[PDB]
Each structure stands twice: as C-alpha cells, then as structure tokens.
Design a protein around this ligand. Structure first.
Ligand SMILES: C[S@@+](CC[C@H](N)C(=O)[O-])C[C@H]1O[C@@H](n2cnc3c(N)ncnc32)[C@H](O)[C@@H]1O
Length: 283
C-alpha cells in the first residue's frame, strides 16, 4: 500500500541516508534540488549516504570476495566505489534504464574501470545475471520488481554457495505486500538465510525531517514536472509511515545456504525477522 506508492515515484547516490539525530535547519528537499548553492547539507547528505553504506556492508570482507553483482545499479556509484577501493574485484551491474546504462558506462571508463566493471541494460527478473557471484547488491531495487520469485531465483542461481546478498528495502509491519513472511518465503524458497538486519527507519526519517516542508516545497515547485510533484508527496507519506512504525527501512545481510532444508531456512529466518537491530543499538 504505502510501500508501492513510493516506488512508483522513483519510476551521486540514489538512496538518501542515516541522520543519527535531527539537525535543525537541514532540508533534504532543498539540498536535492538546488545543490548549486552547496550548503553544508549537500556534504551532510553525502556523509549520511556513506553512513547508510557503512552499515549495509558491516559484515562483508571485500578482501575475500572476487565477483559482485548489482541488480539495480543506478548511476553506478556503488560499483565504482567498490572497484576503485578494491582492485581485485570484478563487478557487473544491471539497470533497466537505457539512460542510466549510458551514464554508468561513461563514468566507469572515465575512472579506468572498464576492465573490471560491465554494465548492461537488462531486467533482473527476466535476464540471467552474467556470471557466478560472491556478493550481490540490491539497494532500493527489489521493492520495484514485480516478479520477485523470478528475481530471487536469478539471485540464487548466480550466487556461489555461502555467497552474500546485501539489500536495503522496506518491510511492511501490518499481491506482494513486503511483509516479513513474504520476504521470508522469497529467501527460503531460494536457498537464502537472513543473517541479521538493522532497522534505520528512525535515522532515515531524521534525514527527511522538515518542519517547514510545506512552504519549502511550494518555493521549489515555483521553478518547475508534475510527475515530480506526486513523487515527493510519496516521500512525505513514507516519513509518517516510518515515524509511525507502519513500515521499516531495513538493511538486510543474507547468506546463500544451499545445503540446508528450505523449511528450516524459513524457521530460522522467521526468528531473525523478529530481532531487527535498531541502528541506535548498533556499533
Ligand atoms: C532507487 S534506484 C537505486 C539505484 C542504486 N542501487 C543506488 O542506490 O544508488 C532503483 C534502481 O533499480 C533499477 N531497476 C528497477 N527495476 C529493475 C529491474 N527489473 N531490473 C534491473 N534494474 C532495475 C532502476 O533502473 C534504478 O537504477
């Protein structure tokens, strides 16, 4: 319900991140639209986006991994950062946007990474991933893909046993509805075990906190285009839902477990879905 409206809206970083506390006067809406007037909020938003990534990758040892798949790679920042900082890695990205693919390819080559990063305009539910991977990334992607069964079969068939899947996505706390049980069915039917999960709902909502959002949004809307108006209304409904606990923004750490009984993956995953760790309790 509320989750589907935010993903219809989306249709350097295309996630927006972890504010440990509300910082008075920061405006996510102003930063995202007029960064030409680069506030501290421009660099403050970048800091919070790196912090989201730090938590997402908390358990991954990149020195041990060889091959990475990003099944919704946006503008390629995650692949490029990984490739720049870990010269041994080989990384592939899929995006369904032709425009995004062109950008990814250009940015990859500008940084001299075209020998280790490949970009494809392909559909992660319809097109097999092009290799066998040790780590799979889906940051705000799986929630956008209707055929989740096909997506998670594709992930399974192209993940080495014991390989890792890290995802940022939404859990609904009350037709795929993003419930715990629905995510669990996807993982357990496809040889995936939830290892742990950090709930950053409070800190993501801190990023979107704007006591003057109404008069701020009108001022920017004056330089407008209408598809972008209901798209940022979908974001304020996510704020309420996050504050209210209706949905959770969750950073999943998942491991492929080919040798375990699927019914036992489900049993174990269900326990882990009830012990999400609040970011405020994370270190
Ligand atoms: C909110 S963006 C996230 C981009 C990137 N992961 C990031 O964090 O900056 C969602 C991305 O998923 C991609 N995407 C949506 N559906 C897809 C699909 N079925 N197959 C492959 N990519 C898809 C979009 O093209 C877009 O790049």
């Amino acid at each position: 319900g509320i989750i589907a409206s935010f993903y219809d809206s989306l249709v350097h970083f295309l996630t927006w991140g972890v504010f440990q506390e509300i910082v008075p006067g920061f405006s996510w809406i102003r930063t995202v639209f007029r960064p030409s007037e680069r506030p501290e909020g421009r660099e403050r938003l970048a800091v919070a986006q790196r912090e989201l990534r730090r938590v997402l990758f908390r358990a991954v040892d990149l020195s041990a991994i060889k091959n990475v798949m990003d099944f919704g790679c946006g503008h390629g920042s995650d692949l490029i950062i990984l490739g720049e900082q870990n010269e041994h890695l080989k990384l592939d990205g899929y995006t369904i946007s032709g425009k995004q693919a062109e950008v990814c390819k250009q940015r990859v080559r500008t940084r001299g990474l075209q020998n280790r990063i490949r970009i494809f305009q392909r559909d992660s539910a319809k097109d097999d991933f092009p290799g066998m991977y040790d780590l799979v990334l889906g940051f705000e992607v799986a929630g956008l893909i209707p055929d989740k069964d096909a997506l998670f079969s594709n992930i399974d068939r192209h993940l080495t046993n014991g390989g890792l899947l890290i995802m940022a996505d939404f859990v609904a706390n009350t037709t795929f509805s993003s419930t715990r049980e629905q995510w669990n069915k996807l993982f357990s039917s496809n040889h995936l075990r939830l290892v742990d999960a950090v709930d950053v709902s409070n800190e993501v909502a801190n990023c979107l906190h704007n006591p003057d959002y109404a008069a701020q949004f009108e001022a920017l809307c004056k330089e407008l285009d209408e598809v972008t108006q209901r798209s940022f209304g979908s974001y304020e409904n996510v704020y309420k839902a996050l504050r209210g606990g209706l949905i959770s923004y969750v950073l999943f750490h998942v491991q492929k477990d080919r040798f375990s009984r699927s019914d036992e993956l489900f049993h174990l995953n269900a326990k882990q879905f009830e012990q999400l760790t609040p970011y405020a309790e994370f270190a």
